[PDB]
């Protein structure tokens, strides 16, 4: 009877249009008595807006949260009851504490060496941000560019975090002056988002 608890996606908590949710997952449940009861708690006060997904052959419970409550460091906790198990198992999750810090966003063009290739790499360096919760996307002239990969945040020297995001694009698109932009979303950013463009001189 394993009990795991996950935070909402960084983007969901930052964008008012999206819906952030905390997730209580469980495995190794008793096929003998495989019902299970979740009891949620926000800052030590019980809530009842949680929904349990249909079981799987895994029982997961999803609590929707207010954007501001998560960002203001409220504690979330699901109590897991089950007759086939001693006493209930409590687990708590929260946003990482500590002075928030603004990300610095730098776009780097492809190396001259990579121009020999058919596809080139557009790089975005994001550094100096805290906590590590962050989201990154790319677009070109309004439309989303999806052929990218973003490294997980990594601890830097000063306790803040950094990451790299690599957008891969055909060399042709890059060499005829197409405009590419990387959008970053973080709590310490104005309006929780900013964007930086990258294009050939």
């Amino acid at each position: 009877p394993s009990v795991f608890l996950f935070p909402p996606k960084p983007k969901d908590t930052l964008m008012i249009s999206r819906t952030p949710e905390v997730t209580c997952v469980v495995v190794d449940v008793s096929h003998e008595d495989p019902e299970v009861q979740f009891k949620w708690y926000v800052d030590g006060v019980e809530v009842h807006n949680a929904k349990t997904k249909p079981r799987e052959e895994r029982v997961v419970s999803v609590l929707t949260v207010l954007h501001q409550d998560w960002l203001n460091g409220k504690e979330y906790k699901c109590k897991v009851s089950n007759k086939a198990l001693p006493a209930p198992i409590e687990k708590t999750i929260s946003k990482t504490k500590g002075q928030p810090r603004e990300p610095q966003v730098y776009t780097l063009p492809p190396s001259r060496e990579e121009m020999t290739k058919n596809q080139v790499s557009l790089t975005c360096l994001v550094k100096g941000f805290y906590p590590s919760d962050i989201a990154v996307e790319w677009e070109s002239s309004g439309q989303p560019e999806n052929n990218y990969n973003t490294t997980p945040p990594m601890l830097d020297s000063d306790g803040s975090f950094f990451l790299y995001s690599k957008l891969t694009v055909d060399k042709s698109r890059w060499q005829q002056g197409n405009i590419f932009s990387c959008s970053v979303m973080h709590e310490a950013l104005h309006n929780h988002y900013t964007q930086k463009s990258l294009s050939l001189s």
């Binding site: 990482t96 504490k97 500590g98 601890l155 020297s157 306790g159």
Partner: protein, 57 residues
């Protein structure tokens, strides 16, 4: 914060006694341990890196 993390405690002890760090650098790393205990191991490595880089010239 509240509960005993072995790596956090060990990291705290070492950083407290690193001979080449300034007071402000020492406080910064220890503050990071308090705020972000889950990365105590990486914080200690960064501290040791800075400590060795500032070894008596």
């Amino acid at each position: 914060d509240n509960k005993f993390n072995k790596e956090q405690q060990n990291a705290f002890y070492e950083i407290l006694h690193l001979p080449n760090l300034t007071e402000e650098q020492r406080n910064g790393f220890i503050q990071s341990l308090k705020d972000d205990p889950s990365v105590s191991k990486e914080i200690l490595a960064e501290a040791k890196k800075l400590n060795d880089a500032q070894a008596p010239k």
